[model samples]
Target: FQSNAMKHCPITYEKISDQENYSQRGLHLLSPQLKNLSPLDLSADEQRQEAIARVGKMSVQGVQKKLSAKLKIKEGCFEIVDQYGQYILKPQSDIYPELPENEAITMTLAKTIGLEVPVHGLVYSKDNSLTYFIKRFDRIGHNKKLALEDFAQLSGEDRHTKYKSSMEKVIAVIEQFCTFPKIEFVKLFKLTLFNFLVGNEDMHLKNFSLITKDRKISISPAYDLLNSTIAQKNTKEELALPLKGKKNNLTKSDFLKYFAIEKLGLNQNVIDGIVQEFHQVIPKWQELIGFSFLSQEMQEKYLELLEQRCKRLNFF
Candidate 1:
C-alpha cells in the first residue's frame, strides 16, 4: 500500500492490493533495498520546516515547499526523510489545503490519459495528514543522477522569467533538442489539451524539461501537474505560457486548427484520433475523480470544471 492516489503498482503499473509488497521479481518504486523502509515520523509542521531548510541547500527546484527525502528501513517500517532520499515528499501546504491530494490525482489522471508520469502517490505524515510522494526519475540505482535541463534553463531564463514565454517557444525548444521532434510534438499537443481540460495553468518553462540518455534527448516525464485553479481562486489566466497570442479565451482554432494542424503539421487524422481518445476516456476520468481523496466539495468542484471545460471544447 505505497500510495492510494493510484491503484496501479507504482513500479509496474499492474493492478495491486494495498498490502502487496514489491513483486517477488524485485521491481518496486523504492528499489528492493528500500522494500522494508517505514514512513516518516514527524509532525506536518516539523516536516514543513525541514523542507524549508532543505530548500536553502539547493537540493531541488520549484516554488513549492518540498524535501528531497529517502526511504530507510528503520526499526520496523520504511521511513523516508533520510539524508540521501531517492523520493520527493511534499507536505500539506498552508496556502493550499489539499495540494498533495490535488497533485496526486492530477498526475494519475495524466497517466490514465497515456502521458508518462513519474511514480507518485499520497503518504501520511506523523499527524496522519496525507503528503504527496514521487519517486525521483532523475535518480537511478544508488547515486547516479541523469542529466536533465528544464526549459527555463535551456532557454536561459531563471525562475523569475519562467512564465515569460509562450507555448510556441516551448515547441521551438523541443524542436531544437529532442532527437525526434515530430513525436514529441504530438505529446506536447496532447499535454496542452489535457492541462486545459483539467484547469492546470502552471505549465511554465520550468515545468517542461529535456532528459538525456545514451546520447539521445527527449521530453522528460511530466511533473508538477495539478489543478492550480482549485488553489488559486483569483487566477484568470488559462495558461502560464501564452498560446496564439493569448492565454485565456482560447478557442478550438487555437488548439486544433492553428497549433495542432498548422503549427505542428499533424494531419487531420491524428488530430481527430487524439480528440476521440479523450472522448473515449471520459468515464475513466470521471471514475478517478470520484475515487480521489479530495473533500466532497472539492470533488464536485473538480468535476464541474472538467464538465465545463469539455463542453467548452465541444468534446461532449
Candidate 2:
C-alpha cells in the first residue's frame, strides 16, 4: 500500500464488483430478512398485534410469537431498512454481556455529537435476550456491504499485542491501508479527543479499524464507543497511549497540539479545524439521547450524565 493520503470516496461510492462480493459474503447474505410473510397466511392468533413492552427488561418469555432480526449487512456494504420494527436480533451469547447501560448511552451520545455513528438501538428477544443493533454507516442504500478491517486484523497484530509504538506508527498504517486516506486522520483525532474527555477507558488496541474500497483503505465508522468510568470504578486517569513525550491527564494539554503539531505531523491550522467542527456539534449531543433505545428513565439518566461531562469539557 502507498503512504500518501487517498482521496475521499465519491457520492456514488457503490461499485458493481463490490456489490456482488457483498451479496456473497455479507452478514445479510448469511441470514437474509423474512420479507414475504403476510398476515393472511399465518393463523389468526399470530396475526394479532405484537406488543413490545416499553418498560421492564425487554425479553421474550412464553409468548407464542417471538421477535426476530436478520443480520442484513455491515461495514461498507448494506444497512437495515425496517424502520417499522426491530432491525437486529442477536443471541445473548453474541454480545459482550457485561456491557453497561449508562456507559453505552454515553458512547452513543458521543457518536451522535460527532455525526459518525450509524443508527443504533437496543432490541430484546421474546426469550429475554438483549442486544444492540447499530445501522451500518458504511452500508449502501439497503443491500450493498461495505468491506472493512478491524485494527487487530488490519495491522496483522495479535489481539494481546500491546500497541507500544508511538501514534506515528499507527498513522503509517492508516495512510497505507486505510481506504479513505487523509480524511481518516481528522476522524481519528476527533474520536480520540472525544474518548479522552468522556472518560472512555476501554478503547485499546482492538477498538479501531480500517475499511477497504475502490483500491483505498480508510477508518471505519465509530462503534462500541462509551465512557466506562460511569459504570466501572478504578479507571485510568489519562489516555491509553502517550503521544510525543507526554502522558497522563491528557485533557490538560491541547489535544490538537498533540495530533496536528507533534504526533501526526500536521499543522496547528489542522488542529483548529477539528476543534472548530467539534465546537459546532457538541452542544446538540443530548438532543440525540432521546432517540436511543434505552428506557425513558435510562434516557433521562444518560442526559444528566452527559450534561455533567459537557460541563467538564467546557462544552456548554
Candidate 3:
C-alpha cells in the first residue's frame, strides 16, 4: 500500500506539476516574474531589492494541519500551529501588511547575529502558498498557553506611548507582574540593543512583551523584528522611537550616551560589549540570505543590497 504520509512517501514532490498550487485565487504569492524559476537560480540583477522571499510551499490549510499535528495546539484563526511546539504558521499573501519587508529581514538577521530569536522560516505550502512563522518563545515543552502580558497592556497604553519611563520604572512594573523580574532584565537589554543595531524602528510598546505563568515572568522571544531603514525612499526620520533626544543620523555614542547610559542605566562597558557582540555576528548575513525563498536572481539582488548595508555597519 502506498503510504499516505507526505514525508514518508518515497516520491519526491515536484512543484512544477501544479501551477495553481503555486498561486492563490489566480494571484501570485511571490513575484509573478519569479514564477518559473527555482529559488536557487541566482543569475539576474544582484542589486534589485524587493519583498520576493517567504515561507516554503504548502496551502494555509495544509500548513495548519501539519503544524498543528506537530505542536498539538488549537488551530486558531489566521495561521495554524505546527506541533513542533515552536513556530506559528504564516500564510503567504497574509503579511502583517501594516509593516514592511525590511522588518522581516531584520528579524532574520537578528537570529543570524545570535540574538535570542525564535526559529523563523518561509514555508511553501503544497499548494504553492508561502508564509512566514516564528517559533513561540512564550511556550516551551507541552502546549498549555504560556501566561503572558504585553508591556503596553500592563502599562494600559498603546503604541503611541514612548519609552518615557526609566529602566527602574520599567523594572518596577515588571516586578508587579513577575516573580523574578531582575533575571529577565538582561534579555530585555540584549533585545533592545539588538533593535537599535538592526535599525528595527518599530519595536515599540506592543512589540516587547513578557510571558508569565506560575508567578514567574520572562522576556518573550523577539518577534515582529525587521530592518525598516530600507523601506524609506529618502532619509527623514531616524527611528520610530527617539534615543536620548537625538533622532536622525544617530550613532553608537548616541546609543551609549542616551538610551543605554541615560535611560537603561547601563554602563559603557556593557553597552560596548553588546555592540562588539553584534560586530562578531554580522558576517552570518550571507548564510541567512541563502535561506530566502526568492528566486536565485532575486536572492542575489537582495544579497547585493544587503552587502551595501553591511559595509556601513561592519566597516567602522
| lDDT (CA) per prediction | 0.78, 0.48, 0.47
Task: Give per-residue CA lDDT, model 1, range 56-101, as digits (tens).
Answer: 6645578898877655533424344535567788888987768988
lDDT of model number 2 = 0.48
Best by lDDT: 1
lDDT of 1: 0.78
- Find the 10 residues in a row with the least total lDDT in model 1: 21-30
Best by TM-score: 1
The parts of candidate 2 lying over 4 Å away from their true place are 1-107, 127-130, 136-147, 162-166, 245-247, 252-254, 290-316
User: What is candidate 2's TM-score against the reference?
Assistant: 0.58
lDDT of 2 by residue, 1-316 (tens): 4222212111111222522311222223233542211111222222122213221232221122223333423322222223322332222222232232333455565655564665443333233333334444455444655675566655667656544544556677787776555678777777777776565655655567666666767776676666555444455544555555344544424565656656566667877676666667655555444433344544554566556655655665
